[PDB]
Design a protein around this ligand. Sequence first.
Ligand code: FMN
Ligand code: SF4
Ligand code: FES
Ligand code: NA
Ligand code: NA
Lengths: 417, 155
Amino acid sequence: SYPAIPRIYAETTLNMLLKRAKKPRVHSIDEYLKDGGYQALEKALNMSPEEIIDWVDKSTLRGRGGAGFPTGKKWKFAVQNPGPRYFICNADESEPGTFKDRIIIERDPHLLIEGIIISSYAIGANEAYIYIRGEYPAGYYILRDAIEEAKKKGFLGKNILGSGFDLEIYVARGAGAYICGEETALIESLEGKRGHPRLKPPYPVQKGLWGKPTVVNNVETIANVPFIISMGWEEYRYIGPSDYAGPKLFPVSGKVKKPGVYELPMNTTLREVIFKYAGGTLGNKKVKAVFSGALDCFSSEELDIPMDYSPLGFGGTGTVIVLTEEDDIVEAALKIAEFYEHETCGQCTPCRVGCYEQANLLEKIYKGEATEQDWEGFDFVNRNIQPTSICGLGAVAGRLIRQTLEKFPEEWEKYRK
Amino acid sequence: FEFPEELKTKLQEHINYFPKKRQAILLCLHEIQNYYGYIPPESLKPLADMLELPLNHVEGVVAFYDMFDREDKAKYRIRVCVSIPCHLMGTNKLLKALENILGIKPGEVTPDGKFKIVPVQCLGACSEAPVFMVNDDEYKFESEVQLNEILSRYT
Ligand SMILES: Cc1cc2nc3c(=O)[nH]c(=O)nc-3n(C[C@H](O)[C@H](O)[C@H](O)COP(=O)(O)O)c2cc1C
Ligand code: SF4
Ligand code: FES
Ligand code: NA
Ligand code: NA
């Protein structure tokens, strides 16, 4: 018995990450085992850690948490430093529009757990953590129960399956701060502190949890690892286009007929996501813009781009929020400003004051109360959130809003007049 | 101020769960809030002692993490997404329905202490917008009639 959760729609053309999670229910260990679950783990424990790193490297897997760092390379960096080492699953998923990770957690927890065990073995970590946002209580209870299932079947604990490898997985909960998804802030929170990002360098792979080598990976990233081991890295690389291989989850929301999570290859275009998969727009209205979470704004002239990691690609985490012709872009921009205002940790002065002022001033603009100096101030603040910032939030808090100013000048003009 | 045995036992489970005691601070604070309907200011000193932490450390943590509420006691927290795209899909209608049913606005508690409306950033269920939670339970808002039936399940 778990807390109620909405039944997010999920669809897959690949039948990998959503093979089970396309059904809105918890798949417990017996059902998982019937699908061949934990067999990739068994295979991994007969390989050397170095071989697993090699396979994950050759797979071309990249981080699905937004920065797109090559996963195998990250692991290689960690194992250059002496142990003990720590592995962390980042389940903090808190960006507007992003709900891809939760359906893995809530529906196919053993896929994630299996990935965690393999990844931990690869980097020689005997202690792993899942940090799940506080607003995902069902996910937390489901993970705690799944871990106990795995322990009873002998997939966790000491001397796993006779391999001499020991692991425990601990589940931590967040308590309302988006910044705790930033990997160094997450580590601070795991250490029982306020979730304040750390100056980098050093990076976690060198100095992380308790100052030890620490790999942090996103839920979706980790869920790919069982597939790489099961299929082999070559077979994995045949999924999707040569240059951007592997399955990807796209959480699609806003003004589409079929909002939900789509598992698609990365040669899919933004237009296809909206019109071929998500059923087109509500009322068949014209698309005005797509917000890539709280990161980027794409116009209707930019729908033919690939959902990949290329320079001209969609990028981000693949979050697709669709606005149609009747939606107010300034109102939407205000929602983004409000997010960054609420989430800055306030350590860095331009971020602290910039996120606040951006939202404050935009609200005045939206309500038709802004002076000419407010408009000038708004432009200035928007361009000056980033200086001295020590994490990615300060660097991007003005990005999407700036894109709306550049791509929708007419709409902003109406507010100025 | 002392924790009741039934609460103290759970706190102790959390504290023994991670390799280091202090790692359990957020689990403990969640447990405290679920028990009392808020974080009593008096609870922090004895919590700090169980975690082997200074009081000011625990105070700073409570202040930082948005989910914790030192001021208002409520049996049920109705967390309402006020982000994007919930705003496109009818957050305003959800808030109006809540006002019609309970007579309160965001930030307010009902006179009986039963419900508090808490505005929150994206709850990660955007496809099912507009989204709200009632304590741990999460729902899509469809209509006032539907909402009224949901709220009747919390007694
Ligand atoms: C403000 C901020 C918030 C972030 N939130 C998340 C998040 O919720 N989940 C996540 O996995 N990564 C998040 N990241 C990225 C992490 O710092 C990190 O890059 C990622 O967890 C590493 O895993 P990956 O290589 O598998 O993507 C965030 C970064 C920043 C700057
Ligand atoms: S850039 Fe902003 S969110 Fe990041 S550490 Fe600085 S103040 Fe905190
Ligand atoms: S915008 Fe409301 S759940 Fe994401
Ligand atoms: Na291919
Ligand atoms: Na109504």
